[PDB]
Design a protein around this ligand. Sequence first.
Ligand SMILES: Nc1ncnc2c1ncn2[C@@H]1O[C@H](COP(=O)(O)OP(=O)(O)O)[C@@H](O)[C@H]1O
Ligand SMILES: Nc1ncnc2c1ncn2[C@@H]1O[C@H](COP(=O)(O)OP(=O)(O)O)[C@@H](O)[C@H]1O
Ligand SMILES: Nc1ncnc2c1ncn2[C@@H]1O[C@H](COP(=O)(O)OP(=O)(O)O)[C@@H](O)[C@H]1O
Lengths: 721, 474, 41
Amino acid sequence: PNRLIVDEAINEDNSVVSLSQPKMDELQLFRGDTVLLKGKKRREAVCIVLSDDTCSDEKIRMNRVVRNNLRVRLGDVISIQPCPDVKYGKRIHVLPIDDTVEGITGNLFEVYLKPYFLEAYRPIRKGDIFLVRGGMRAVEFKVVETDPSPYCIVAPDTVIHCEGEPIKREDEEESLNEVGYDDIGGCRKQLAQIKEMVELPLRHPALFKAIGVKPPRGILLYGPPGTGKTLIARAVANETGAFFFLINGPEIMSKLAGESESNLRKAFEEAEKNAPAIIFIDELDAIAPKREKTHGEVERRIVSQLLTLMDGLKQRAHVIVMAATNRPNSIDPALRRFGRFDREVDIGIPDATGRLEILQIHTKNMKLADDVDLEQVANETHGHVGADLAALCSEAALQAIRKKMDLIDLEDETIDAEVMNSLAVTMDDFRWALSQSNPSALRETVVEVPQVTWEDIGGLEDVKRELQELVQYPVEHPDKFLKFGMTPSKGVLFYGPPGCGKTLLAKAIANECQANFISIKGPELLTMWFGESEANVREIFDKARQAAPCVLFFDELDSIAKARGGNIGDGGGAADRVINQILTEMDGMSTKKNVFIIGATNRPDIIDPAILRPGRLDQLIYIPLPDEKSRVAILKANLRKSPVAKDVDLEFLAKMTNGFSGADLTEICQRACKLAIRESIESEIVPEIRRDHFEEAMRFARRSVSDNDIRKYEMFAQTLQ
Amino acid sequence: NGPEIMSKLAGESESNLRKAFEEAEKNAPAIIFIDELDAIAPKREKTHGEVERRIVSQLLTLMDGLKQRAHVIVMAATNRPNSIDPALRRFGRFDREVDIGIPDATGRLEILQIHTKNMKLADDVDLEQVANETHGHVGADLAALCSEAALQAIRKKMDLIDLEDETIDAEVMNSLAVTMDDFRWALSQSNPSALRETVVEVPQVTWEDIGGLEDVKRELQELVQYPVEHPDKFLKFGMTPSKGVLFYGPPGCGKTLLAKAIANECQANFISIKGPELLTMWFGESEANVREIFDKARQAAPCVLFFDELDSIAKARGGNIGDGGGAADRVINQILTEMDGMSTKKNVFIIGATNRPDIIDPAILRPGRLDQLIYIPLPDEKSRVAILKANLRKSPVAKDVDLEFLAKMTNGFSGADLTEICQRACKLAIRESIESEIVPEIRRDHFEEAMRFARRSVSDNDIRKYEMFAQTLQ
Amino acid sequence: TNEAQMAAAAALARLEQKQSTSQDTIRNQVRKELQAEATVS
Ligand SMILES: Nc1ncnc2c1ncn2[C@@H]1O[C@H](COP(=O)(O)OP(=O)(O)O)[C@@H](O)[C@H]1O
Ligand SMILES: Nc1ncnc2c1ncn2[C@@H]1O[C@H](COP(=O)(O)OP(=O)(O)O)[C@@H](O)[C@H]1O
Ligand SMILES: Nc1ncnc2c1ncn2[C@@H]1O[C@H](COP(=O)(O)OP(=O)(O)O)[C@@H](O)[C@H]1O
């Protein structure tokens, strides 16, 4: 009884844990009460319990600081008990740990400990280790003396002493600046999926010895460089405690014949001796490239050696092998057969939210000025990966250090704590670093859950509802579909003029469903055909299966028909190699994988009719240019983020822009916004957009769809009845 | 296994392979199993190195040495029987072979039951639902599925009770049941390894699923059953049984269901070849795959090999225009060849389907090939009603629904179009039922509304061409 | 008890202050004006 599973916390605070209410009622404690935690080897901690809507009933959520003091790891279980007799302390003695007091001098108490405890009212226990962040350094301290014992709350009126040399870290505790899960920003879903696969085999090996189940013995990670593939592999080993062995392709390949095989075997033999252990092989495609793609005997031999060592993992107890590559299909397929590397996780590229999280992670210690806006940076850093965002944080820190501190300090390794704490990084330093950095992954496609909602789309009220019926109803009301023998559609095709919101329709339903949006463009379908790489069709559909829930959007479906001539071409049909592979993958995809396929085209008259057969994109939705009420709605939607003067007549503008698409109405709003901003900036050398700004914008905006194109689209839609 | 031998240096791989045979003799009777055979003895054209050629020759001589190594049998496993050195299949050696393939729905259910023998299942667990849903899975995937379903249940309860020790109390496992939500969850997490493989099985299509065409059903029984039910009567009367039939007529009239239904009644393995597959072979100039398809049919005998959309290639070449040539192409020529060499007593029946007989090489209709012709017109008045009744056999239908009235209106509709009407009415009933909670049956209003959106797929210009062709055939 | 509730109030204030649009248009317009003045001189 009163035993809870240790897991990660959302609240980063050094004295806070979170429980689900049913456990707070059974433990007879209230929100804000102090409790004691009992871990391993007679180690205890004191904390405050809060609650949220994310902790499960069986779990207790805590940060690394609490787990380190209890000598427990994620997946363990501890005891919890209330202690309502906790009172305030009188005098405490806190000293830093030498592991973090390097390159720094000055009054660490006044810089770190005093801000940390002042109005903080934190519960402490003798021997507690806690981390205080600031001045671009993270310093951890130990409680070595308390007048009350073993625990007390430190009030602002207590005496805090700090006299003596920094304390050497003990072997029973780990440094709080070591890499853990809280250092990983984006790809949180992937990290959770991996944790489930590896944490239990390593944390509780007894259960797999006794229970008739096979553990994963190999996980392949893939994505561009700098996304965190090697960060995850190390963070997992650090969190679980397994010995981490590092291997990389090019180093093993740099060895002579016989040396490369011996070195690879040694790593596996050492992992068994040090089990539980994790073997991470970086650049897997370099150590084990496809055999059919090389000529060398040594390269074919090292693949055979790795294949046998992977099979030997059925005998090497508690050893998991992980690997990283840039492309999941650039390695010899034998490694991915049952057993061996039977699991894989797509890391990809962080999205806008993950990029902000990474910037926040790499600023934990940084003092930021009020003008610093990392969300704006995350939105501007398109194509950047964690390696690039970390560079931006460090470069911005250096610029602030050179502007101020380099005119104060000597060219030495030791700086006063007060000087470091006095240094804050401004937005100009982040903008400078942004101009110096260059995205390492700008060409690769990025898949993310879109931020487009239904309120972002003007008009098309019936289409928005129709997509909800097509995408949500099959899983929200499955008993009605079964009752009436209905087969849910697997997708819908959109056709009509460009610039009417087709991209928002697919994103908006993905947003409400919290699903990833995968955007495939014509140039990708054209590359597959011309480059004789039709196998990339499977990569696209597999990305959807692995990214599920997701919406798989195939834009420019006409690109294949156009490649065959489009308007003229030969005497045959639109059938070709790429579309046949696409249709095959569609037929083999189940709706129970939470993947919905949406297509679009601006030339529906040349789409291979096969795509419209039952089981494919059988439903057709026409998206014409917005009507009178929709054009006004579009203008109003774009202006929701800015004050609009009372002299602006949006209905008059919409009546004039009769042939304009939604994309063209957006340009008018954005241009009028820019014009209002231009005036605002000059007034400081205004609070709202004036009629003059919209009328001026009207002089430059033009319709993107000609009158002849409108008739072509309307006649086609009419032909379909 | 391949990698174990290939990882060894020149001289070590040959010695180790020889020792394996020596040990089998010393311990005879013995069985040697060579996994990933194609890794040790790949087709000769796939390797040119001196070391790789020598180790292959060593295997060939050791296989021949089995004449002296009494009571030793060597088995080997490969992914494809044609990816290995053909010399291995010479009389003796590896002359015998067995196609393991993949399990069907029945086999998958048996596999799930086997890998759950030790598992405690909740009352809601239904492994038949799983076996039917696990399309494209192999036994190794179903075993992984069972493990993942158990692991989810284990994490929920085993960690909750905090059973942290070296041994598990038997009572804890005794009360730990895996629910249907744990299997369905695992199904969402798993991913079949054989999703793109060819699936060959006895179809579940019955004659009760096909409306109308009573005379075609009887004709297929004569063409497929009689040659093997009464082989002595065919000899007595000097009758040569047909080896196949070509179906023609408007699309969407059941051509595929007819081939499946007779395969089901006869419990024969049904092989489905579709237009995209015929086009893939044509586009890639890989018509040799046709011989592999017919070879699979022979291995699967008794079987029914159905070639749908035979006109897909002729249409891809232009169909009505194209070039000035004939209906012959790389793929159909190999199909014609394999039928000509097919043995009457191999219990292989070939069925084709086209929508444009005027562009199919007439040679396909010669004796020994698809010599029989069956016309499948648009369903008549009584058949369209039967089709609607069959399509609605899985849903509640209100008594006010007049299926004869609907069939009378849908005079130009195919069976495929009647299904669209049924599904539209079902969707409307679903939307109405869901709204009532924010109904128990499909109402006439739902079918009447569907009638305003459904259209006939085959126009009168095509029906007249179909009828005139059928008339030309007398 | 009461000392624990004061500790909880302090922890809640720290977490909520740290964890808890026309401004991005204003920032982008000021940045564009500063770049235009830097190019005219
Ligand atoms: N997903 C991520 N989240 C947080 N930080 C990341 C992420 N990906 C990379 N980084 C950071 O970028 C750097 C990557 O360097 P390294 O660990 O050598 O990885 P790589 O394999 O890309 O070379 C580290 O400073 C790491 O903290
Ligand atoms: N109906 C609409 N409501 C609001 N904005 C729209 C609408 N249609 C288009 N837009 C704007 O036009 C831009 C282009 O839309 P998109 O669908 O990508 O056009 P395309 O046909 O080029 O893909 C979008 O960023 C969106 O802001
Ligand atoms: N006679 C029939 N009875 C019942 N359903 C039919 C009939 N004819 C066609 N259908 C419906 O039409 C659909 C298409 O049939 P199929 O034979 O696969 O067409 P094709 O062979 O031209 O591709 C089937 O799913 C079936 O439900």
